[PDB]
Scaffold this active site. Structure first.
Site, PDB file in Angstrom:
ATOM      1  N   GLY B  16       0.847  -1.184   0.000  1.00 12.36           N
ATOM      2  CA  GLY B  16       0.000   0.000   0.000  1.00 12.36           C
ATOM      3  C   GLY B  16       0.883   1.234   0.000  1.00 12.36           C
ATOM      4  O   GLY B  16       1.018   1.912  -1.021  1.00 12.36           O
ATOM      5  N   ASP B  17       1.456   1.557   1.154  1.00  9.75           N
ATOM      6  CA  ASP B  17       2.362   2.695   1.306  1.00  9.75           C
ATOM      7  C   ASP B  17       3.607   2.070   1.915  1.00  9.75           C
ATOM      8  O   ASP B  17       3.688   1.807   3.123  1.00  9.75           O
ATOM      9  CB  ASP B  17       1.776   3.747   2.250  1.00  9.75           C
ATOM     10  CG  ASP B  17       2.306   5.145   1.974  1.00  9.75           C
ATOM     11  OD1 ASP B  17       3.532   5.371   2.105  1.00  9.75           O
ATOM     12  OD2 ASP B  17       1.486   6.030   1.633  1.00  9.75           O
TER      13      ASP B  17
END
EC number: 3.1.-.-
Lengths: 126, 126
Positions: B16-17
């Site tokens: 995701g991040d």
């Protein structure tokens, strides 16, 4: 639908790039009105929507949305939205604050009702 | 360090991040030179660095970096970088392409050497 093995994963990616967005749409007319929507979403560069197509197949329910340079998985409305969110939730962390807040709205809707949404101020104004 | 239970999670949030960035820094002089760096990173709004402080405590090794409106967890260099990446990797998906590519560089370094980096073109130019 039962998962738990990867439910741990999707909580991660969600907490990463994953919107448990909820909002009120107008109804019974047009301006200050009354009818809402609860949406889970994930939007990756159209570069790689295959993952977005994977989300759909892993999660089963849903659809990918082609919006130009970006596309996105949108579960959509309460039906499959409660089996998913409910299952995800226990693998909380970041965004699973509203996982619950949404799960809350997705209930008892016959006034504290349609009030949780603003509280779902994940930097959403007015 | 052994984990596996949440290693499934962090693969998510990473995918995701999460940056498994790798790059070549100059050395033996200054311009077209020869000395690299392999970095795992996660950068959340300074709004919520506590998660970034959680990453550090869950992962044990690392530090948070205050950069204004954003801060970030930076593992840093090969040492703890190989125990982590190696463990994460099997919970691949998105960014775990370079999980390996990095794990590759983090090895046999006494020319195909310092060449993987550009190949780590996750939209990095030149």
């Amino acid at each position: 639908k039962y998962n738990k093995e990867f439910l741990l994963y999707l909580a991660g990616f969600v907490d990463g790039d994953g919107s448990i967005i909820a909002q009120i749409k107008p109804n019974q007319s047009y301006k200050f009105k009354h009818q809402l929507s609860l949406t889970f979403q994930v939007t990756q560069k159209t570069q790689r929507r295959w993952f977005l197509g994977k989300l759909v197949d892993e999660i089963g329910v849903g659809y990918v949305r082609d919006r130009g340079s970006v596309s996105d998985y949108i579960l959509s409305e309460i039906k499959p939205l409660h089996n998913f969110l409910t299952q995800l939730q226990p693998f909380l962390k970041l965004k699973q604050k509203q996982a619950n807040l949404v799960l809350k709205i997705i209930e008892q809707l016959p006034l504290e009702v349609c009030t949780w949404v603003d509280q779902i101020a994940a930097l959403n104004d007015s």
